[PDB]
A paper describes a structure:
Across all domains of life, a widespread class of OB folds have specialized to recognize and manipulate tRNAs, perform key functions in [name] trafficking and metabolism, and are designated as the [name] binding domain (TRBD) superfamily (IPR002547; PF01588). In bacteria, [name] [name] ([name]-binding protein, 111 amino acids) and [name] Trbp exemplify the free-standing, dimeric OB-fold proteins that bind diverse [name] species. Trbp has been suggested to facilitate the folding of the [name] structure by binding its characteristic elbow region formed by the intercalation of the D-loop into the T-loop and was observed to enhance aminoacylation by several aminoacyl-[name] synthetases (aaRSs). Contrary to previous proposals, [name] does not recognize the global [name] structure nor its elbow or anticodon but solely binds its universal 3′ terminal single-stranded CA dinucleotide with a strong positional, structural, and sequence preference.
To confirm our in-solution finding that [name] binds the [name] 3′ end and to visualize the interface, we determined its co-crystal structure at 2.6 Å by engineering the [name] ASL region which does not contribute to binding. We observed two tRNAs bound to a [name] dimer in crystallo employing nearly identical interfaces, each burying ~ 484 Å2 of solvent-accessible surfaces. The structure reveals acute bending of the [name] terminal dinucleotide (tC75-tA76) away from the [name] body and its preceding single-stranded nucleotides (tA73, tC74). Interestingly, tC75 and tA76 are independently recognized by two pre-formed sequence-selective binding pockets. The penultimate tC75 nucleobase forms a T-shaped π-π stacking interaction with F78 and is further anchored by hydrogen bonds from the backbone amide nitrogen atoms of E32 and K33. The terminal tA76 is captured by a predominantly hydrophobic pocket, with the nucleobase sandwiched by M85 on one side and the R75 methylene groups and I77 on the other. Single substitutions of evolutionarily conserved, interfacial [name] residues impaired [name] binding, with the largest defects from R75A nearly abolishing binding, followed by K33A, S82A, M85A, and F78A.
Residue numbers in the entry:
A (entry chain B), B (entry chain A): 5 to 111
RNA sequence: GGGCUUGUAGCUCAGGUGGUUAGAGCGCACCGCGAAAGCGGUGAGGUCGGUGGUUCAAGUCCACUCAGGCCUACCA
RNA sequence: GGGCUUGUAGCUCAGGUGGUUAGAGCGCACCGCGAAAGCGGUGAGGUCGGUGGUUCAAGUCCACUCAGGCCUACCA
């Protein structure tokens, strides 16, 4: 089921810098994260606690969807979502191959 | 301008392995690339020749859109596109933070 | 930007393996025949688009060039 | 899963930060008045949801518990 370029341009993929990360109390799988997009901050809920510690995420530059309707998970309002890739073994966040300033748009 | 999750699920983001890369004859900006998605290959045209040489791309794992309608550029049929981020200075392709098998779906 | 193809008599065309091999039909001029559409006979008509090569020998092969038709590229 | 709140007479409720202070309106019973809708008078009605505590003093504060209502979490 194939799409045109306009289907893809509806989505806003951006590079964001992780400022804070912590486990979510009562959840086995969730992390709450604060992200800088350069000119504004976001709060995101990411179900990757089983694979990433909060400490190793701080300072990383990662790829997110920035224009999703906010959703409340575990009481926290999540203002975007972190992309992850999985093959049925490992799970990985998504990063820029070379360093770019936070807020960079993907295309 | 916000979107729902169903708008995002229309797009098929994948991790692909670069098998071959070459400049496109007569073009200023284009590279032709062969990519493995694990069980099948793709051919893509990517306008990043000013920032990446063919040699440093071969063997890399990068993030692509896999379900776009094919488009013919410079005579080559391009069956997807490599994502890149730019901040107005440098430009960078997108990679998995830790190694995952080619064909992994982003979500 | 990159290709394919055509260019020979006034017009439409023939001329495979370089030599056999530059001709046909229509048209034109003249002489006959026919009621007419037409037919017979005798002729005239050629920068083989142009230039340079190859070869004992080029319309024919190679390269450059001019003109008409057509296909394709122009930046995930 | 995490919270807030209510529970007092047959019904609806008062008792605001421990003592003043467990009462009201409706309803019920009896006695009168009125043409009637109604009114006056006299009464009955209480495990203050249950248990254990604190204090000179608990409906009131603490802890446990039972029942009703409502808010919220349940995996980017």
């Amino acid at each position: 089921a194939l799409i045109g370029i306009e289907d893809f341009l509806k989505v806003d993929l951006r590079v964001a810098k992780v400022l804070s990360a912590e486990r979510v109390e009562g959840s086995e799988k969730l992390l709450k994260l604060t992200l800088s997009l350069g000119d504004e901050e976001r709060t995101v809920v990411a179900g990757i606690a089983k694979y990433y510690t909060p400490e190793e995420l701080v300072g990383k530059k990662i790829v997110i969807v920035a224009n999703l309707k906010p959703r409340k998970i575990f009481g926290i309002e999540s203002q975007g979502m972190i992309l992850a890739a999985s093959d049925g073994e490992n799970l990985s966040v998504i990063v820029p191959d070379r360093d770019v300033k936070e807020g960079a748009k993907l295309s």
